[PDB]
Each structure stands twice: as C-alpha cells, then as structure tokens.
Design a protein around this nucleic acid. Structure first.
Lengths: 164, 161, 164
DNA sequence: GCCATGACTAGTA
DNA sequence: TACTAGCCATGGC
C-alpha cells in the first residue's frame, strides 16, 4: 500500500491506495486516523488524482474521475455511495440521506458514517449539513468544511475563506 | 379554580380545575398553583373513577377535560388519549401518528408537560427499545401503573421492584 | 466600583463591588465579559470574601457568608436566587431549577441565565447540570467546572482535576 | 436570531 | 454498555 502527500490551500493532503486506486484521502489533524499498517512513500503515485485535486481548488474542476476502494460497513457503504449523488455546489442534509438510502430516522447514524469517511473531498462528506442549515462538524475542522463550501458557490480561494 | 387532594397507592393526587371540568391532575413531587381554592367536595365523579382505576376495574375514563397548551402539545396529548388501556406506544410511534415524524424527542417533552396525569395516559408511552426512559412522578411509578394495567389487578407492590 | 484580583487553584479570580458588597466575581477567559467601567483597583478589598474563598478551595468552607448585589432580568434574578438554594455537594438539572421557579419548559432558558451569572462561585452556576448526568457548559471551560464539582465531592483540593 | 436543554433514536467498539 | 458531525419544540433574549 502506497501513499503520497501533496500540498493544498487547506494544508497537506495524504492520498493512499493500491496502484492507481485510492483507499484513503485524509488531512492533517482530523479525527479517526486509520492504522497506516504497511504504508509506503511513493512520490509519483496517484498522478491522475493529484492533478485533479489541484484543479478543484484552482476553480476549474467539478466532477472527479477517479478509481476508489471503499472498505466499510454496508450501512457505511450505502451512505458513502449516496454522498457521490450530491453534485458540485449543492448540499443535502443529514436527514435527507437517511431517507434517500431507506433508513428513515437514521439522521444521526449518518453523523458517524460521515466522520469515518476514508476519502475526503472526492467523496463529499463536507456537502452534508444540518436541517437548519448549519455545519455541525468536520473531521478536519468546521472552518475547513466552510472553506470547501464557499469554494463551490463562489469560486473563492479556500486560502482565504478559511480565516473568517 | 378549585382543587382537591386525595389518596392513591402512589400517594397524594391533587386534582384541579373549574366547576366539574378538569385542568390538572398532579401526583407528588412531579415536574404554580395561584388562585387555587381547596374544595374537598369537588370532582367526585373523577375521584370515584380514579379508585376504580387503581382497583383494576375501570379501564375507560369518563371525565370532561380542559387541556391548555401549545398547538404541538395538544396534538400530542390528544394522541395520548387514543392509546388503549394496557397497551403502549413508542415516542416514535406517537411522532408518526401526529404527522410530525422524526420529532419523537420533542414528543418526550410535550409528554413531560402533560398537565393531567393518568387520565391522559402519558405513562404508557415508552422507548422503541421498550425502555421506560422517564416519567414525571418518577420511573418506579410509571412501572407500577403499567404493571397494573397489564394485570387488571393492584400492583401497589411494584413500586419497590 | 473596586476590584481585587486574587490567585486560586483554577486561575486568578477577580472580585468587584461597592465597599464591601459584591457585584461581580469572575475568572479568566470567562464567557461573557462585562465592561469594567469605572473600575478602580483596591488590593485590600473584600478580605472577608477572600479568606472564605481560600478556605473554599482548601475544602474547609462549605457555605459563604457574603453580601451580594445581583443585577439582571426579572427572570435571571429568579434563577440565581434558585441557585443559592443548591447545597454544597449536590446538583440540580437545568429544568429542575426551571420547575423550582415555577417555569417548566424553560430549561434551555435557564441555560443562558447561568451563562450570565455575575458571581461565579459564591452563586454556584457550577452545580447545575444536564439531566443526562453529563455537564453541559461553563464560563471558564468544563475543566474548571469539573474541578469545582469534584472539590465538593471530596472536601479535598481537586486542582489536578483541571487536567483529567 | 441567538442558546451551558431534554421522558429519542440509530448504529459500532 | 455507552459512545456521537442529529433532530425538533421550546422559552428567554
């Protein structure tokens, strides 16, 4: 299992997976770090994705063509699959997904499922929010989530939104 | 408004209201009684029934109620009244039943604010896990009343399980 | 208005008031700063109240003999008055207090009123907790809340509880 | 338009 | 058991 850390406007992102397939995408200081058992530094890895992320922040990207290995509970899976439903710039609520995937009255259970997302950004755990419309939490900081949302309505540098 | 305290297996019940219409029924140490005048001759229709209930004979009250409270509380309480004797529903089920699904916690609090205990069968609402989860005059009373309605016979004893 | 700032196990406390009657008592980085308008420092001030606090933190003093002047809402005064009810070493739920000043349903409301208690220990906003058992929030952080509650529970300095 | 609430509910370690 | 990135109705402010 190979891993690579690139820079970003919200800080270093660390991608990981097998060959060309991402298993992980995490940030600096976000809760629930996976055990990184058998991880190897590979500077040239995930070049496809690495390009695409850079573009995303640069404004020019909206849909992510990448290969993913999502490993986790069928409830967790069913959720995360739904997250990719969510288009660029749009937002859904915790409650709404619990409906979409047919687990009505599981609005909170999603809470956990979002946080155990192993592949941030590309799987958009940041596009899910409270029914009132408030950011309730983010693995890597509530403010970071905010910066990622304010990118997607106005193409505003997360470099900035981040210190508000 | 005029009021009267009586006994029961679970200790003093205070009934209150105006004329023969009942606004409150409160048991001891529960979760503002201004202008209230004690009148030990009142609500005897109600009081009769409340003994019958505890004897395990009455299973359908016949009293006039005055349920002052918020819109959402009315709707809840009114829904409490549809729960038959010796059955039970979840806080969820009620939420659904009043067409405000996913409010069940709120049902909890409306349920908390029942101004008229027992006759409004708020104690028959329970957790979807079957858990008791709390009652105004304590959990042990809740258990007692439920056990009573199950057995159609006094569960005076159940207060000390 | 005089004030005097003294040391304590939970960080320095500042007492203010007129002559010998206490109007405020607050901690560092406490939520809801009041304006210190026309405050002038008096390092000999309130020596009654002081020698009691040292004794309170030594676990010896249990009931404060002190003249207060509280200022706030019709309601806020009801709540704060309800607080001097609570004996050393016991607690009450938020809503429990609500009931006791004849205003059921106002739990979340008593929330704020504590927030705004001008005198922090002597009037024990710290002895008020969520019915869940979990302790909900505190002016100078839960660390400090926890510590005080443990102090009363042990009749013994709990100045490590800050770090638990 | 803010919240230091609470008789809920749903999945994991 | 007991954890939560939730929820909805509140009552002051």
């Amino acid at each position: 299992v190979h891993y690579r850390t690139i820079d970003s406007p919200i800080g270093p992102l660390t991608l990981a997976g097998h060959g060309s397939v991402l298993t992980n995408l995490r940030m600096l200081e976000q809760t629930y770090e996976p055990s990184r058992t058998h991880w190897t530094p590979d500077p040239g890895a995930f070049s496809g994705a690495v390009d695409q992320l850079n573009a995303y922040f640069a404004g020019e990207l909206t849909e992510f063509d990448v290969e993913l290995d999502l490993r986790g509970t069928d409830f967790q899976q069913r959720v995360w699959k739904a997250l990719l439903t969510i288009p660029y710039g749009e937002t859904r609520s915790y409650g709404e997904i619990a409906d979409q995937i047919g687990a009505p009255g599981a609005a909170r259970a999603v809470g956990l499922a979002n946080g155990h997302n192993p592949i941030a950004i590309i799987v958009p755990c940041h596009r899910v929010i409270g029914a009132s419309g408030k950011l309730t939490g983010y693995g890597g900081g509530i403010n970071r989530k905010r910066a990622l949302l304010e990118l997607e309505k106005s193409r505003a540098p997360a470099d900035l939104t981040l210190f508000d």
